[PDB]
Amino acid sequence: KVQELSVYEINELDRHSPKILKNAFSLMFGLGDLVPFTNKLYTGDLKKRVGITAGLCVVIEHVPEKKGERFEATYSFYFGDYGHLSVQGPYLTYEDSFLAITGGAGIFEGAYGQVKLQQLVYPTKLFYTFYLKGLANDLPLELTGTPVPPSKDIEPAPEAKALEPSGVISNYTN
Amino acid sequence: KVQELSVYEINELDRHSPKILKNAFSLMFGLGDLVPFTNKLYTGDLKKRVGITAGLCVVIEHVPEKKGERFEATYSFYFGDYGHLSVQGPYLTYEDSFLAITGGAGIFEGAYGQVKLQQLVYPTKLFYTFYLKGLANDLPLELTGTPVPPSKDIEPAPEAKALEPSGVISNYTN
Amino acid sequence: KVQELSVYEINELDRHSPKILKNAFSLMFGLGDLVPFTNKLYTGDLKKRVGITAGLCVVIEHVPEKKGERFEATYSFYFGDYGHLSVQGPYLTYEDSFLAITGGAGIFEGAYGQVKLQQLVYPTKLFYTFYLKGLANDLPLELTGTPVPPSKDIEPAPEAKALEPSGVISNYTN
Numbered sequence: 280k281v282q283e284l285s286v287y288e289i290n291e292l293d294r295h296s297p298k299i300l301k302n303a304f305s306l307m308f309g310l311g312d313l314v315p316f317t318n319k320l321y322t323g324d325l326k327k328r329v330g331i332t333a334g335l336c337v338v339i340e341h342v343p344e345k346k347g348e349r350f351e352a353t354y355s356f357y358f359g360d361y362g363h364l365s366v367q368g369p370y371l372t373y374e375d376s377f378l379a380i381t382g383g384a385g386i387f388e389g390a391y392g393q394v395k396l397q398q399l400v401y402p403t404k405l406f407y408t409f410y411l412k413g414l415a416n417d418l419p420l421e422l423t424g425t426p427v428p429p430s431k432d433i434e435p436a437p438e439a440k441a442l443e444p445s446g447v448i449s450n451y452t453n
Numbered sequence: 454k455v456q457e458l459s460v461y462e463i464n465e466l467d468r469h470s471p472k473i474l475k476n477a478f479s480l481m482f483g484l485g486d487l488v489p490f491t492n493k494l495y496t497g498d499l500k501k502r503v504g505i506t507a508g509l510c511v512v513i514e515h516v517p518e519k520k521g522e523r524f525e526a527t528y529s530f531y532f533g534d535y536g537h538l539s540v541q542g543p544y545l546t547y548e549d550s551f552l553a554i555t556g557g558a559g560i561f562e563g564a565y566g567q568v569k570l571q572q573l574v575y576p577t578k579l580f581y582t583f584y585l586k587g588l589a590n591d592l593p594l595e596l597t598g599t600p601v602p603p604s605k606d607i608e609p610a611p612e613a614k615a616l617e618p619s620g621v622i623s624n625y626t627n
Numbered sequence: 628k629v630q631e632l633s634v635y636e637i638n639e640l641d642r643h644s645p646k647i648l649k650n651a652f653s654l655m656f657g658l659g660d661l662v663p664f665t666n667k668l669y670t671g672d673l674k675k676r677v678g679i680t681a682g683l684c685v686v687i688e689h690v691p692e693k694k695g696e697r698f699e700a701t702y703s704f705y706f707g708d709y710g711h712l713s714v715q716g717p718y719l720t721y722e723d724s725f726l727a728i729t730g731g732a733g734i735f736e737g738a739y740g741q742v743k744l745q746q747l748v749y750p751t752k753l754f755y756t757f758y759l760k761g762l763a764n765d766l767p768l769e770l771t772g773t774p775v776p777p778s779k780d781i782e783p784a785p786e787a788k789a790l791e792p793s794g795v796i797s798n799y800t801n
């Protein structure tokens with residue numbers, strides 16, 4: 280029994296993120312470089328600010344033939360009063376990936392399955408579709424609005440950007 | 454289905470912990486700062502030493518209006534030869550939170566659900582209630598004694614602190 | 628319900644791994660020390676390269692009485708186009724341990740359970756046995772060949788080491 284939940288992760292450059300901790304003996308990213316990060320999170324339909332992403336990217340290797348990096352990522356997605364989802368897996372700057380859903384809290388207690396990561400604009404816009412199993416209830420309607428198809432040009436609704444009650448969930452994470 | 458398990462985490466300052474790696478742009482905690490840690494773990498009734506917590510807090514932001522920090526935490530709870538529980542989620546220095554139970558080993562194989570984290574004395578005393586689903590069996594009686602109600606004043610039993618046989622589980626983690 | 632899967636992890640010294648981030652005051656490993664890593668992953672029968680391991684070891688304590696270290700490990704095992712498995716738990720340099728399976732993706736979507744970690748040569752050769760629950764299908768035959776007897780002398784098939792078509796899985800992770 281799968282419930283799809285899609286969200287847009289956007290770096291609006293106002294959270295001091297990403298923070299690069301440089302250790303690799305390379306001008307390029309390399310093993311040793313650690314990247315704590317936190318970006319804003321919006322609903323799949325771009326109408327509401329829900330919260331944030333928060334966690335750690337561990338650089339694994341630069342991939343020169345793909346013109347990108349492989350990170351191993353451990354982080355959570357915060358949904359204001361509703362709770363959160365946690366993930367572990369590959370973040371490849373150069374292609375879509377699937378991460379494991381390691382669990383959740385709140386309405387996400389019991390969550391499991393995988394989530395597809397699509398990078399739209401490096402590094403500032405990402406789109407995700409969680410294929411959620413194990414939820415106690417149907418997801419709230421304000422989170423399951425039909426998603427905006429992902430494109431380079433997507434923007435949150437101005438109400439969501441401006442943090443108006445119509446453009447946020449209750450206690451949205453910040 | 455839900456088996457509730459409570460434990461006290463106590464920092465007794467004898468494990469080199471916390472170790473603060475301070476990298477942030479700020480004088481206060483900020484993104485970039487990392488805090489590997491390990492504390493002692495006692496049963497919910499405070500009668501027995503069970504083991505340790507072990508993992509990493511990733512600083513996400515300072516929260517000036519709440520006089521405290523938001524961390525993203527990834528860590529495990531060790532119960533001697535019984536096994537361990539793993540978690541991922543928010544640790545807020547100023548209020549309670551819930552973390553995802555990401556999995557378990559030993560008697561905790563198959564573990565899922567969420568855990569409530571209550572801070573009792575910052576930073577040395579914390580109380581957790583795991584709402585455990587998925588376990589193959591009823592939890593052993595030595596781990597499910599009636600919890601001491603959480604307060605600022607709790608202490609582990611003097612026999613547990615002193616690592617006497619009556620105050621430890623067999624091969625308690627250290 | 629339970630499907631067993633063994634793999635060999637081998638550091639062939641060509642991936643810049645491990646990377647020791649030294650922060651503890653001591654010449655020996657201690658809390659503060661972080662070790663990003665990535666090794667090669669082969670089938671338990673050693674006939675095929677499947678992919679890699681990738682993640683972070685957090686040093687928890689040195690254990691003088693065992694002449695070794697305790698790490699807390701967060702990492703994934705990559706199986707090419709099959710997907711991946713993610714884990715959280717203890718790596719002890721001086722004895723076998725079990726880690727938690729936190730989830731998977733691809734064929735390993737919905738994966739849970741635990742994995743045994745057995746060190747064969749510190750730290751270049753390890754042998755794993757996953758006890759996998761939650762999988763949609765039986766594991767593919769090319770991953771379930773009888774394991775080579777674990778020892779310090781194990782080596783990948785020469786076709787596997789040389790990346791010949793007959794010694795790799797489809798789109799093996801690198």
Ligand SMILES: CCCCC[C@@H]1O[C@@H]1CCCCCCCCCCC(=O)O
Nearest residue numbers: 645647654655656662664684700718750
């Ligand atoms: C979960 C572990 C899986 C594979 C092991 C991987 O290589 C990583 C092990 C972490 C640390 C071992 C590195 C030891 C190097 C010692 C040199 C520095 C010193 O002796 O203090």
